[PDB]
């Protein structure tokens, strides 16, 4: 079905990726990306057949069939052969399914696109449906639904899908488990594979495909490659499944629900089923609704709710739904009188809607949002060849080929009829209510069948209703003022004579530390700024940590109302506690960095506290404390492990207990004492100059000395923290019982040595070589569990090797198969040939060496090095040049007498996490019981620290 | 002369019963029988002084009682008695006073009969031939020659000389070259005629008082020496006494200006007062001695120090002859004390008028009464020589029942006597004597005997009557009392918890309580030690400075209440720790709950005065930038004690941080420390466990009562670890003293943690190189004066140190130290067994020693609990393991860590230079790349 139509695609003029689109005669919208300078090539394929397009008897059939579409072709009927060719050239495919789409994507290392795409086209010929792939992938779909059993967003999602008309096919079930895929069909005698081959042959080939290929050859050669390669798919003309009305057909409207979640949260949910406006992408009323409802400005709804102290944060807007209709949500946090006086809350909502009904739509908001998305859209930097192409392929169904990039990202017109129409749609006649609170025990009878949430109707009497329609007035509510953080600084600064490729210490004092680099590649009017404020007092005591976090918490609570316009304009910020101190990250444009930073430094320099707002902050973070008995036991193990593997660390119980006495005057005395004496370390990166960096930095520290009288710190009070020495042959462990999860976790730690030139490439290469066979034999082959991880841990200037594994097992039994895996690796090293080794270190070499593709990434990497005080910005040459100079026997020496169980250099410690109720292993040394972790750490050495490069 | 008077003798801790009796020749005999004395003794007092001297020859009686030593008729040889003293440990001495001549000696063990028969034939036959005369006159010339620089006899002779020169109080007491053989022979007077006249008619007559500290029995030496001493013959020698004070309105209301030889500055105030020797019932002048030298609430010296003029004072009842007595007040002088003398005397008269206003007091009387009753009850011991001669000194004046309650007990209250001496404490009665170096060109009147010069300079009348006229009540007020329970001081019997080492009777996350009852000493004593652990003590220079100054002014605060309790016999000490605060309570079992409750209530609710803060601030600031001025070995010790701990705030940043200490910032600092804290506690001595728990409960209840103290977390009862050296490195750098030209240096060796092997490895090698260091380094090489070696117990880690200040190149000095260490290596390896064994026995007795008081074992046990070791049986184990060693054993200790080729060498030095390996640029960056030692497991 060879067909082709393409030309210039509007491409946000910073990019060099040459574009074309085409559509074959079998309903295959192919997008052509030609960037002959790309490192990673990739391709992706979306089919507009979703899980609302499932057969009505078996749900997630297309889901499991595209799982099965992976394995087994007619040209290569081998099971993993596609994935095996992605292991030959480092590719990592995945695919996904939505209510309207089923989307596929893969990658390839550089140029091997003929190979992988040849393995990719012939999926349509012969799926196999053998014992292993079918009967094991259905187990993975069961685990897939099972990990989403307790995931509350999908829970409340499916309950939204389910509490409408159960007759309407919008209310179908999106993803089924093994009970629905091969337990109900065969007990009903339904052949699963007949359905499978039916769907696969008669439904895939028809239409609705979307394709994108990131190739680096040209447009035309890859065009007559693929259009030649793709003619086997033939147009069967399956029609597009659309729904012309929502299921919420007057049985479930103007109704309340009180739902019991899995996590202890409190949220309010109001929903409006609304028709589609995808046809109006040139005017886009949905960005106007989300921009105007979720605005945080003067006279806004959220400003009033902060003023009444009911909502911490919120999100609302138009949510996608079926093809014909969509949804409109408002999601807010709840306090005390958020729990008791919900009626008045909805009255306040009606008041804000009354303000929207008073002044109606606005044009200056249109023009302003148009300019913001216009300029911000045309300054895309670059993109990842994976994920971006899957996104564009995801939206390639809805747009002609020149509108696939400027989808709503250019707005010509203004359609107040639409905004007034959906304003007419947003009425008390059109309301679904869902209350989320854990506290509704003994109160909620109607239980969810699949996931298990519990709820009730509590029909609203007519008095409240009649008062809701007639009493809609305006009080404080005002339209949101025009933005002022709109940028004009779009001038690329020419590079100076100072042409360093890395940030130099351009300012050295006893007060500060200043690192700076101007960009050379991305050529954007943007900058990234990171700042840490050292302090001794940040982690001295649980009380100090509590007052630091609650202080900075209400600080961020304070600065929200000013920051909202800048953050909506593309000027991000961050406030963060460390054990060291406050952490300030600033990311945005080149225009208004002094302005924003100045008001931030001035605000947190002299700062004031509200009473009942802080009472809410106290209560809320107090609820956030005791929620740390409910996490995944691998997270519990990683928390405790890096708890133990530092110098000082406060436990969450003792941090939880210290808030019993924290009053506002104790804090208000504490604050300037905390702020009294501190240091500042700074990285500045982006399209600014050295002199302006000097200016900004001097400005900040001057502002600080003006407000809070910061004096520099002596070099005998800038300390770091060490990591615990192990007794050089010990294998130590302890256990913790989780209460929520019926699963055991484990993490085992191996101290090699500091980051020296030998140890870096030893531990990285050995990590790589223990990475893929662990996945190949422990999660895949031995079928231990789903949470299986192996690899490095370099922290506190100390390298390490780790295994992060969560299953439902006895932990010494788990240890036994860990050691069996260690013996398995032990023999699997010694039997490896030279060529596998050479491909493996070539893989390591190209995996490690790469420049990033975003300025935010590499700045965060450099900052993460600077907070570790290493500064070796030329790890690349040193490490890569060292890596060629390794042998097999080096690793043998690295494994046997240092890492193995028969080793005089065992720096070995395991962590057991016990569940809520609880092929050869040798005779390991005896463990230790650990009662007091402190009395364990009592007599134990501590490491040196690292010489900075 | 067998006369006899005896009965039951009242004496209560001591049980050795003694008894007094009078002989018919006028000898007061006291029997002392102590069969537990090593050296026995005896003493005789003669009530013949230098007031019986002839007016023509001065100091005759001192030379005559000297002449009785040499020459008997049994043994007229020159050193023969002296040979009986050198063979039998004897050492006699005797003196002459205004009214007494007293004899006292010792003897080796039991040599009674020998010394007795010699002591009879001293008084039966003295010979006085020629050689005794002509040789004893040189000893008397030395008796005069020793008083050139002897200030006691100089100032006292100046007291003898500034009165009536006709009165026999103006005679001399010793006799010099001039009066003994320059003054008689030109007058032709025979000295020996008067010597035999004086000896016969005045020495031999009466008024002897013998006392003999013996170990033999109570009756055998008694009926030996009763018959044996009849050689004394009654002649009724008159008592040379004065019926009036010798300073009689010639020199009254007069000043003196004295120029000394030593640079001292003093002010002397004198009141002559009539005899109250009969008045031992109330003893008002000594009661005034209680009221003058009191330094307490509302005292005189409180304002005088508060005006900053007078350093110290002393006052009280000074004896004279029998007839008269004196009352003196003698103070120290500052520079500006010279300028405000009139105001000083003005405040003195203000205090006199305050005592005249409120009159006598009874509480003071009962208080002194009870305090001397307890101090009489709990007397320690006695000197084997001198005690006898002293109580024989008061045996002349008191009946046989009053010889023990000598001044330690008072019968009656006499306010009329106090008003009498208040009539004596008037501006009409004052005698003034100023001692100052600055009186140059000022002192005309020359002393008669010595030849120094002084001057009267009477005060003109504007100031005299202003002393009279201004007699007002001001500031000065009465003291306070702590006489809670003077009846119960009972010993507490040891119960079923018979442990020789302290048991932990209470441990929480809030406190830690260790307990031991006495077994050895069984005294009315108790010792209490308290550590108050808190995180906030060493957070920065600022909180550490504010904690230091906090407890500093707390010590300044407590004092004002504390002095009246200190008068009751309960001492204390506050000094903080680097961890937290440390509290000491030492004393009786009597009233420390009542005390300690008020101590906690005060240090919990604490205030600051502003100028008090300023003075302590400036003063410690001065003490800080003063520390740049001391000896460079102290610089090396303290800066190495910085370089080898976990965290350390230096004195430079401690010095700078005092700019920021304001009173409200401290006022915020106070409850923050006090909000949450930990207590470490030892209660040790003859005390109980259950009441210790009740007291501890009172403590924590008071802590919750004031600041709502809740415990500290159990991962923050931490210690500080010590830095691990890089296993072979010997690195060095230098420091600079600023003031002194001397160089400092310190040499360091890390062996190990305190294990049982390492304690004795360390002690044994340290002392085995200690005595040859005496043999070759200070004596032979003459390196310096600050030369020290020995252990280094720090953060539970042993170490070896060498403390040397000299003026040397430091590497040169290191070179000869290491040459001494190589010398010690061969000097061990050539050692025989005998040196080795004598040395390990030396070390054995060096380490092994029984305690001597509750405070000693308390200091040891608590001194180990503060190191968290708790190894309470190091005594047997450690020392028994030291005996199981050879010399090559400590060589094996000296090879792997201590030798020059050592593979575990942990050696690091500190040079402190005058003002005129690897380097260490930054001590933080030094400690950046080096490992750390672990901590010690508490037993």
Residue numbers in the entry:
A (entry chain A): 46 to 963, 981 to 1011
B (entry chain B): 46 to 56, 58 to 962, 989 to 1011
Give the text the authors published on this PDB structure.
IDE can effectively degrade insulin, amylin, and glucagon, pancreatic hormones that control blood glucose levels, as well as amyloid β (Aβ), a peptide implicated in Alzheimer’s disease. IDE is a 110 kDa zinc metalloprotease that readily dimerizes in solution (Kd =~ 10 nM). IDE has at least two major conformational states in its catalytic cycle; open-state IDE captures substrates and releases products while closed-state IDE performs catalysis. Within the IDE dimer, each IDE subunit consists of ~55 kDa N- and C-terminal domains, IDE-N and IDE-C.
Further 3D classification revealed three major conformations and structural models were built. We again applied IDE dimer-focused classification with signal subtraction of the IDE-FabH11-E dimer to refine each conformation separately, which improved the resolution significantly. The three apo-IDE structures derive from combinations of the IDE partial open (pO) and open (O) states. The three conformers have resolution limits which correlated well with their relative populations: O/pO (4.2 Å, 73%), O/O (6.5 Å, 16%), and pO/pO (6.9 Å, 11%). Furthermore, two subunits within O/O or pO/pO states have noticeable differences in the distance and buried surface between IDE-N and IDE-C and the dihedral angle. The IDE pO and O states differs from the pC and C states by 5 Å to 24 Å increases in the distance between D1 and D4 and 7° to 17° increases in the dihedral angle, respectively. These changes result in decreased buried surface between IDE-N and IDE-C in pO and O states. Open-state IDE has an opening just wide enough to capture its substrates, for example, insulin, TGF-α, and MIP-1α/β, allowing the IDE catalytic chamber to attract these substrates with high dipole moment via charge complementarity. Our cryoEM structures reveal that only open-state IDE can capture its prototypical substrate, insulin, and release cleaved products.
